[PDB]
């Protein structure tokens, strides 16, 4: 029954618009297979189309906004694109139709509506780009009846081992097709749909814009050779219309020119299924997906007071659909330094300089290939897997579809090497690499990231202990299934645990350091003078200078999260020897969090260094770091330490802004200094942990119950309303929010852990 749920999930999720780095495209969860992408741009001149054409996601003055209005990766969804430069409102509707042995069928409708500011006679070029990778696979455009291109539909017939036989149809569509009266129309036709069928080496098929432009430039070179010149030029849209040459190859370019509004369908028909997919099929499945998406949202994300209203419901659907809509499939090599240079052990003073010397040897090499199925922080800016981000992204996804979330956890944990290391940043394949400078690509096997994926496992464990509809919840509704999932992953969880304790260990025994445990102390590897990137709080102030004697209260707290998960999953698997080891490790962390990290003088937790005089010194910087034992659920509800953190959290002069908790206190010497990334702004991910723990205390007999209930109520309201106001004003989820103005700032389309707001609104933790 585990391998049967497996096959039905594999097949449910195979197809999707799993190219979030582009406005619209499709690929299956297979490295070397069939991919599609959409391009469009207005053409007003002989030189503008190269600047107007759209393919990879960006965010600038020329784009008002874009995102999924609805999405469920089992069924499909609807994307809205609002393009100022090209004067177009586009809708891309994608739908999956189960059937056959090959992951089923799909269809997509592309609809462009010129906005009021667009010239009514605007010429828009639309390209549907189709590529297929693999040694023993075939794809052929069926030639038209007409000389110069297609009056009707374009049919591609293809085959591969992975997909079997399939047809991909690009329909004629609705919309005026411009007609040239020029001489050139005798050789190129007056204007029609055209297809170029080409071949390139498999590994460059993803370079769709260069490949298209090489064919367009070749068309213009032919105009010059053949005496079409400035005395009497063809209209621009005809100069940029490829010569029809359908055939067989691994790249097929389908080009249309429309005057005014346009629409066309893409119909992918898996031959192993019954009858082929039609446009009437597309419209019915799109209608049904919407109904289902609507019914599930109302049950899964029942927004409670004061966000019961319809305005908060549209907001919630946008933040949720953009988060789950960001899901990509990535395949390729990553760039890893496998030297394990001894400079990486960082056991000297001034270690950052040594590690820089080791990096400057550039022993990093490509390895893999790897695959990853994951949601992402931002389509235009960070369209790839970030390890601790994915913990946050999967909390609302798991509500929607626990089986989906477990697939993504499996996918991430299938990347873990023999030592227990998953790279914090998954840049898979030359396409993923195109977006990232060489210097920033290299992953380092000593660099950790918070194990936030354990929090998703914690939520799945609570659910377990207490056919698209069915598949979504098969891993909870069938307890034998849930347990086998945990049985297979458990070894990898323990491996990661051991790897933290071997590679991210702090030094007690070597200094004047008294503490209940000689063992429990942690220090993030990878820290520079001004940064600690591996903690995830890039520029949060840490001991100066950095020092092999540093201890990091956030890292110890994360190891705490890990043991508590290992306890529950070990218990469930009767792993008695382990459950007794973890229990003794948890007890030592509880004691050592107090002994190495509690400041009675300051009333909070603090990181620690070693002095110019070789003794333990607390370095206190009041902010997120200071709260970490509380954020991570480690403190008993009667703890006086908790009571002092509740005071700091509520204190307007320190962390409490009208807009949420400040990353750093207004009192800290480093508030609003340097790049000011985690040195004052409000971050939704850390506020969400705060909101969850205030609720935990608020729904329990104890001395702080009422203080917690008040802070929970107000913080939930502040965070939700701040993100809601910015969404209403700008259309965007943002990375971070300004505690002075409430403005969203830095990275837009940040869905992204900012989408946690859906879960905050729905409460009932
Ligand atoms: C082309 C290029 C690449 C890179 N890569 C580095 C990078 C990657 C991702 C983030 C976002 N984010 C930061 C959070 O603190 C992390 O906790 C979080 O996990 C990650 C992921 O959501 C921040 C920096 C940065 C810039 C850039 C632009 C402007 C200024 N400085 N840098 C440009
Ligand atoms: C004031 C402000 C704005 C924003 N906007 C988000 C952002 C993200 C990354 C880029 C870079 N960009 C990314 C593209 O993926 C590339 O294709 C492109 O080549 C490069 C160009 O070098 C540009 C904007 C981010 C920060 C910030 C602050 C601290 C840390 N991280 N980010 C601050």
């Amino acid at each position: 029954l585990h391998s049967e749920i497996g096959r039905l999930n594999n097949q449910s999720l195979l197809w999707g618009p799993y190219r979030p780095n582009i406005y619209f495209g499709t690929r299956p969860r297979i490295g070397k297979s069939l991919m599609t992408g959409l391009m469009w741009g207005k053409i007003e001149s002989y030189t503008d189309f190269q600047h107007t054409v759209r393919y990879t996601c960006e965010q600038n003055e020329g784009m008002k906004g874009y995102g999924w209005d609805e999405y469920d990766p089992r069924r499909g969804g609807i994307q809205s694109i609002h393009d100022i430069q090209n004067g177009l409102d586009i809708t891309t509707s994608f739908v999956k139709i189960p059937g056959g042995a090959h992951g089923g069928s799909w269809a997509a409708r592309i609809k462009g509506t010129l906005n009021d500011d667009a010239p009514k006679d605007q010429k828009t070029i639309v390209v549907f780009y189709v590529s297929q990778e693999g040694e023993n696979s075939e794809l052929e455009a069926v030639p038209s009846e007409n000389e110069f291109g297609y009056e009707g539909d374009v049919i591609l017939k293809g085959r591969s081992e992975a997909l079997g036989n399939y047809k991909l149809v690009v329909t004629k569509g609705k919309g005026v097709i411009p007609q040239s009266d020029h001489d050139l129309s005798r050789l190129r036709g007056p204007g029609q749909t055209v297809v170029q069928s080409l071949t390139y080496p498999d590994e460059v098929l993803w370079q769709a814009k260069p490949i298209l432009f090489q064919q367009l430039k070749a068309g213009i070179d032919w105009l010059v050779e053949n005496k079409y010149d400035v005395a009497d030029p063809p209209p621009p849209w005809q100069v940029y219309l490829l010569a029809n040459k359908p055939g067989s190859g691994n790249v097929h370019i389908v080009q249309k020119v429309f005057e005014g509004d346009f629409e066309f369908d893409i119909l992918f028909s898996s031959e192993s299924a019954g009858k082929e997919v039609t446009s009437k099929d597309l419209e019915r499945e799109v209608k049904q997906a919407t109904e289902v998406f609507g019914e599930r949202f109302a049950r899964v994300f029942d927004l409670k007071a004061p966000f019961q209203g319809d305005n908060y419901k549209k907001f919630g659907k946008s933040m949720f659909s953009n988060l789950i809509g960001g899901i990509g499939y990535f395949y390729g090599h990553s760039l890893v330094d496998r030297s394990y240079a001894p400079e990486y052990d960082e056991e000297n003073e001034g270690f950052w300089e040594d590690a820089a010397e080791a990096r400057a040897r550039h022993q990093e090499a490509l390895e893999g290939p790897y695959e990853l199925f994951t949601s992402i922080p931002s389509r235009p800016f960070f369209p790839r897997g970030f390890l601790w981000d994915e913990g946050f992204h999967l909390l609302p996804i798991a509500d929607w579809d626990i089986d989906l979330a477990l697939e993504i956890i499996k996918s991430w944990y299938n990347l873990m090497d023999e030592d227990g290391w998953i790279a914090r940043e998954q840049i898979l394949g030359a396409e993923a690499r195109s977006k990232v400078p060489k210097e920033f690509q290299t992953q380092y096997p000593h660099y950790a990231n918070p194990p936030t994926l354990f929090l998703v496992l914690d939520n799945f464990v609570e659910r377990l202990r207490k056919l698209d509809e069915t598949l979504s919840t098969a891993s909870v509704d069938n307890p034998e299934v849930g347990l086998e999932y945990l049985r297979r992953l458990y070894p990898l969880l323990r491996r990661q645990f051991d790897w933290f304790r071997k590679t991210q260990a702090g030094d007690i025994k070597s200094y004047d350091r008294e503490a209940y445990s000689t063992k429990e102390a942690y220090r993030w590897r990878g820290r520079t003078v001004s940064h600690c990137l591996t903690s995830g709080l890039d520029d949060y102030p840490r001991p100066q200078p950095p020092h092999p004697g540093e201890l990091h209260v956030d890292l110890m707290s994360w190891v705490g999260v890990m043991v508590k998960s290992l306890i529950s999953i070990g218990s469930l698997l009767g792993a008695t020897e382990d459950v007794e080891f973890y229990t003794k490790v948890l007890d030592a962390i509880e004691h050592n969090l107090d002994d190495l990290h509690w400041s009675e003088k300051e009333g909070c937790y603090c990181d620690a260094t070693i002095d110019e005089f070789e003794e333990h010194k607390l370095v206190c910087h009041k902010g997120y770091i200071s709260l970490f034992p509380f954020l991570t659920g480690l403190l008993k509800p009667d703890s006086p330490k908790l009571g002092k953190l509740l005071a700091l959290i509520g204190d307007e002069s320190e962390l409490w802004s009208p807009y949420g908790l400040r990353s750093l206190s207004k009192k800290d010497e480093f508030y609003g200094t340097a790049e000011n990334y985690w040195r004052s702004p409000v971050w939704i991910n850390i506020n969400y942990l705060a909101i969850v723990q205030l609720y935990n205390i608020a729904t329990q007999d104890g001395p702080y119950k009422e203080t917690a209930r008040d802070l929970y109520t107000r913080l939930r309201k502040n965070i939700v309303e701040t993100v809601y106001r910015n969404w209403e004003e700008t259309g965007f989820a943002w990375e971070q929010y300004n505690p002075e103005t409430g403005k969203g700032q830095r990275t837009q389309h940040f869905t992204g852990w900012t989408s946690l707001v859906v879960k905050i609104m729905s409460g009932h933790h």
Side-chain angles (χ1 to χ4, degrees), residues 1-6 8-60 62-144 148-160 162-173 175-185 187-274 276-279 281-290 292-294 296-417 419-437 440-461 463-464 467-468 470-479 481-508 510-511 513 515-518 520-576 578-583 585-600 602-611 613-614 616 618-635 637-700 702-705 707-763 765:
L1 188 64
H2 184 254
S3 289
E4 191 41 34
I5 290 304
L8 289 174
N9 245 279
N10 215 108
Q11 275 209 299
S12 200
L13 289 172
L14 191 98
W15 266 109
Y18 294 146
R19 310 188 68 186
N21 51 305
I22 60 171
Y23 287 119
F24 188 81
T26 60
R27 69 180 298 181
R29 306 219 277 163
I30 303 154
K32 296 157 152 186
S33 194
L34 182 71
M35 301 199 311
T36 79
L38 179 71
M39 306 190 217
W40 72 94
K42 76 178 177 190
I43 182 159
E44 290 179 326
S45 86
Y46 291 99
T47 66
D48 67 327
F49 185 59
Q50 62 202 127
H51 300 121
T52 63
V53 67
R54 296 289 194 204
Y55 180 55
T56 68
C57 296
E58 323 169 304
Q59 189 39 70
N60 54 43
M63 191 87 21
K64 176 177 194 214
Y66 54 94
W68 298 86
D69 304 318
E70 301 157 11
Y71 184 80
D72 184 316
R74 293 187 198 277
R75 286 304 267 262
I78 311 180
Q79 192 184 214
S80 287
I81 303 165
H82 303 295
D83 185 339
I84 299 168
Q85 201 190 171
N86 286 304
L88 278 151
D89 311 309
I90 303 173
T91 272
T92 60
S93 304
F94 164 86
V95 78
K96 285 157 61 157
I97 310 173
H102 291 111
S105 298
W106 59 263
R109 179 160 290 177
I110 315 283
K111 189 161 173 190
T113 301
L114 289 176
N115 72 23
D116 295 337
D117 295 334
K120 291 174 108 110
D121 68 340
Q122 172 161 125
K123 284 141 207 99
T124 298
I125 299 168
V126 190
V127 166
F128 196 73
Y129 184 90
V130 177
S131 66
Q132 189 178 51
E133 305 158 65
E135 280 181 339
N136 288 40
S137 40
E138 45 175 17
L139 185 52
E140 181 151 1
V142 176
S144 55
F148 303 115
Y150 297 72
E151 302 289 301
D153 299 346
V154 169
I155 304 168
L156 309 177
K157 274 171 182 162
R159 186 203 60 69
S160 72
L163 295 161
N165 284 276
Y166 62 86
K167 83 169 78 185
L168 175 44
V169 176
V170 181
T171 75
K172 167 179 175 50
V176 168
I177 129 85
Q179 291 297 272
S180 174
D181 215 29
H182 199 281
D183 243 282
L184 177 59
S185 304
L187 301 175
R188 288 280 205 63
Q192 58 295 309
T193 300
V194 295
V195 175
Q196 296 197 163
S197 288
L198 332 166
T199 294
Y200 275 99
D202 294 36
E203 69 192 71
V204 303
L205 297 199
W206 67 272
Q207 299 193 228
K209 212 186 128 187
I211 286 182
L212 164 59
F213 272 83
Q214 208 61 35
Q215 300 307 290
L216 293 170
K217 286 185 211 147
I220 292 160
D221 284 344
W222 185 100
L223 297 179
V224 183
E225 171 81 344
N226 289 258
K227 312 298 189 206
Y228 303 88
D229 67 36
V230 295
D232 185 14
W237 63 259
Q238 184 177 40
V239 168
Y240 278 79
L241 186 63
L242 293 171
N244 190 60
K245 283 161 216 153
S248 79
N250 68 5
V251 183
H252 303 264
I253 303 176
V254 181
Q255 186 178 28
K256 298 183 180 279
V257 192
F258 289 110
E259 190 180 315
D261 297 349
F262 62 83
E263 79 180 68
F264 64 94
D265 296 342
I266 298 115
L267 311 173
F268 180 86
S269 282
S270 193
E271 194 194 78
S272 88
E276 66 157 49
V277 175
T278 64
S279 303
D281 278 342
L282 164 49
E283 287 167 31
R284 172 211 317 121
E285 298 286 63
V286 170
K287 250 239 262 289
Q288 177 57 204
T290 296
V292 160
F293 178 92
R296 178 99 62 87
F297 192 93
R299 282 200 314 285
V300 166
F301 295 129
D302 168 69
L303 311 192
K304 294 171 150 205
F307 307 118
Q308 341 88 289
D310 285 349
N311 59 315
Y312 293 108
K313 194 144 75 48
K314 292 156 150 67
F315 159 66
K317 281 180 179 166
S318 173
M319 301 291 303
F320 174 69
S321 302
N322 277 315
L323 166 71
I324 193 170
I327 282 170
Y329 179 80
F330 308 85
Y331 178 89
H333 299 257
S334 30
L335 189 59
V336 181
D337 186 329
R338 286 293 185 177
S339 72
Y340 301 83
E343 296 80 352
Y344 297 155
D345 307 303
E346 301 177 329
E347 300 269 46
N348 295 341
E349 300 189 28
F351 56 74
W352 54 92
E353 288 172 314
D354 300 320
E357 281 178 42
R359 286 200 296 275
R361 297 175 195 153
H362 288 123
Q363 301 298 106
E364 59 276 6
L366 290 171
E367 50 177 77
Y370 299 112
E371 73 183 11
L372 182 54
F373 190 59
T374 185
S375 71
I376 64 177
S378 184
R379 286 176 65 195
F381 296 117
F382 308 116
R384 51 183 179 281
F386 286 74
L387 179 51
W388 93 298
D389 297 56
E390 197 66 12
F392 289 115
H393 300 159
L394 291 181
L395 293 171
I397 296 184
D399 295 358
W400 185 262
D401 188 326
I402 178 54
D403 269 77
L404 172 53
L406 294 170
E407 268 287 332
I408 291 164
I409 298 176
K410 191 157 136 275
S411 190
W412 266 98
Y413 273 93
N414 281 323
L415 292 172
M416 165 165 42
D417 77 6
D419 298 337
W421 174 68
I422 304 166
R424 54 175 277 245
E425 188 174 350
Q426 293 290 160
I427 310 168
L428 303 194
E431 189 180 26
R433 277 197 293 288
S434 63
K435 273 255 175 131
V436 178
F440 285 25
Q441 300 179 1
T442 303
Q443 300 317 289
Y444 296 92
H446 56 124
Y447 285 6
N449 216 39
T452 52
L453 286 163
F454 277 73
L455 296 176
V456 191
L457 290 167
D458 293 339
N459 282 10
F460 167 59
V461 169
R463 281 170 70 177
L464 195 45
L467 198 87
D468 295 312
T470 302
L471 262 176
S472 71
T473 60
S475 279
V476 301
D477 302 352
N478 299 219
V481 183
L483 214 90
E484 183 59 37
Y485 176 88
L486 292 176
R487 177 178 292 103
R488 299 198 188 185
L489 179 70
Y490 175 74
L492 301 184
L493 304 183
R494 179 183 51 214
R495 203 194 305 167
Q496 194 171 41
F497 178 74
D498 290 345
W499 172 91
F500 266 88
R501 294 161 53 71
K502 165 94 289 270
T503 63
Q504 314 298 318
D507 184 359
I508 296 166
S510 145
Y511 301 101
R513 258 174 190 160
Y516 171 112
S517 183
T518 59
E520 296 308 321
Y522 300 91
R523 179 181 60 102
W524 298 108
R525 298 296 124 113
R527 116 140 260 254
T528 58
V529 170
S530 297
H531 292 89
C532 174
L533 298 192
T534 55
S535 65
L537 287 90
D538 294 19
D539 64 344
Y540 193 97
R542 302 283 193 169
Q544 285 313 299
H547 189 293
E550 287 177 67
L551 300 179
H552 295 317
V553 59
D554 58 320
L555 184 45
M556 183 163 285
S557 301
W558 284 125
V559 177
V561 173
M562 276 169 109
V563 274
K564 288 179 59 166
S565 307
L566 292 191
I567 282 152
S568 321
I569 295 160
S571 293
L572 247 59
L573 297 181
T576 302
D578 293 342
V579 166
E580 279 171 24
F581 179 76
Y582 306 149
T583 299
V585 175
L586 177 46
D587 175 69
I589 290 167
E590 291 169 349
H591 294 276
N592 268 13
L593 271 174
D594 302 347
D595 294 348
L596 295 162
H597 288 304
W598 181 258
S599 188
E600 269 299 353
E602 297 290 340
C604 61
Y605 299 91
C606 314
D607 287 334
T609 358
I610 292 302
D611 275 305
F613 319 78
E614 303 289 322
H616 185 83
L618 295 190
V619 190
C620 300
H621 288 298
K622 307 205 220 215
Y624 292 170
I625 287 303
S626 320
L627 305 181
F628 247 80
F630 166 67
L631 299 169
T632 56
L634 296 192
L635 302 187
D638 46 72
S639 172
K641 279 174 188 83
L642 175 57
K644 302 170 130 276
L645 296 176
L646 288 184
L648 175 58
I649 283 169
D651 179 353
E652 180 282 327
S653 68
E654 304 256 31
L655 303 196
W656 181 289
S657 89
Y659 308 100
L661 299 189
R662 310 189 188 84
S663 46
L664 194 60
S665 168
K666 308 194 295 157
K667 292 186 158 155
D668 192 83
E669 61 183 307
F670 295 109
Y671 189 85
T673 57
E675 299 169 291
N676 196 23
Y677 195 32
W678 290 86
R679 303 191 165 187
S680 56
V682 176
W683 288 84
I684 311 301
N685 62 328
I686 303 309
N687 277 265
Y688 170 94
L689 290 178
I691 282 171
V692 162
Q693 293 300 323
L694 285 173
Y695 188 79
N696 185 47
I697 292 155
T699 50
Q700 241 196 304
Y704 303 117
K705 191 204 218 262
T707 321
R709 164 64 64 187
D710 182 65
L711 299 170
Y712 164 79
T713 301
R714 287 167 57 202
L715 183 61
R716 174 160 169 279
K717 273 151 91 176
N718 296 345
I719 287 300
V720 167
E721 186 77 340
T722 298
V723 177
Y724 171 71
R725 275 295 141 210
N726 277 287
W727 175 83
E728 195 74 70
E729 256 165 304
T730 62
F732 304 126
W734 304 74
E735 191 177 7
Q736 76 168 206
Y737 298 80
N738 194 113
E740 207 203 311
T741 70
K743 266 159 195 202
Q745 54 181 220
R746 299 198 192 246
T747 314
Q748 312 110 301
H749 296 269
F750 201 76
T751 61
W753 57 49
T754 296
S755 282
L756 282 166
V757 78
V758 194
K759 260 272 240 206
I760 301 170
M761 283 195 301
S762 72
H765 300 289

